[PDB]
């Protein structure tokens with residue numbers, strides 16, 4: 001059965017969007033709309049192995065107290081973002097494994113949806129063959145360890161319909177034991193249409209023994225900007241996409257989710273824009289305004 005069906009997705013009360021919406025004087029309809037929409041909660045190397053367990057227990061416990069399904073995004077892979085706008089992650093594979101153990105300890109038996117490492121498999125060719133294998137082994141470690149929470153619905157990140165081919169990504173997913181997870185995620189922090197991502201997802205599902213997937217619809221309401229290098233890096237003219245739901249149009253699509261948080265910068269992007277992750281009220285307002293809100 002679809003593990004995401006049956007409770008609402010958790011709205012994070014402490015998101016930067018919530019802070020901005022509560023501070024708006026006068027109240028701003030675009031910030032409010034965004035702030036009130038459930039979005040994934042991202043963890044990285046700012047949450048060390050020593051304490052991330054508690055952080056995770058707190059968030060899933062709070063979601064359970066709200067009768068809601070929390071979505072967490074794990075974004076701590078070594079050589080994260082290949083040293084680009086979102087450089088970071090843990091220094092070593094040993095650190096990463098310790099981090100995953102602590103995350104799993106904080107999950108316990110609690111309900112959670114886990115997006116495992118946006119871009120890691122799709123961007124891995126920036127690494128040497130040995131470092132790439134190490135990376136695949138770490139993602140597999142995440143799947144093997146996190147799925148010990150029976151109530152964790154785990155989706156390995158699989159890029160998007162214009163990155164690797166369905167065949168190439170399926171190979172990497174199969175390398176990391178996607179069969180043991182619920183499946184994979186698509187379009188994270190990107191802008192491709194839901195229709196496009198469904199066709200790509202159904203193709204990958206066919207190559208991964210009928211695995212299921214989720215699509216990030218946070219910013220895909222108007223499709224992508226014209227094809228160009230960095231068209232994913234704070235593009236203008238984009239719109240909020242479908243609000244999070246399990247009422248999808250794909251046979252193996254468990255949900256549309258907002259994985260990326262609308263308003264949070266993609267990076268400096270060659271234009272001296274805010275650091276990746278920093279909330280920009282203007283960007284959230286633009287995304288909402290472009291969706292007609």
Ligand SMILES: OC[C@H]1CNC[C@@H](O)[C@@H]1O[C@@H]1O[C@H](CO)[C@@H](O)[C@H](O)[C@H]1O
Pocket residue numbers: 081084086119123160162163187188189190232
């Ligand atoms: O070489 C990386 C490119 C390849 N083409 C597609 C493009 O998406 C990709 O860039 C990455 O895009 C994702 C969002 O889809 C970002 O999260 C990455 O930072 C970026 O490098």
Ligand SMILES: OC[C@H]1CNC[C@@H](O)[C@@H]1O[C@@H]1O[C@H](CO)[C@@H](O)[C@H](O)[C@H]1O
Pocket residue numbers: 042081086118119188189259260261264265266267276277278
């Ligand atoms: O998609 C992963 C990265 C790199 N490319 C796109 C960019 O928007 C994204 O940045 C991350 O965004 C999340 C959610 O807004 C933040 O929590 C991270 O700090 C940031 O690196």
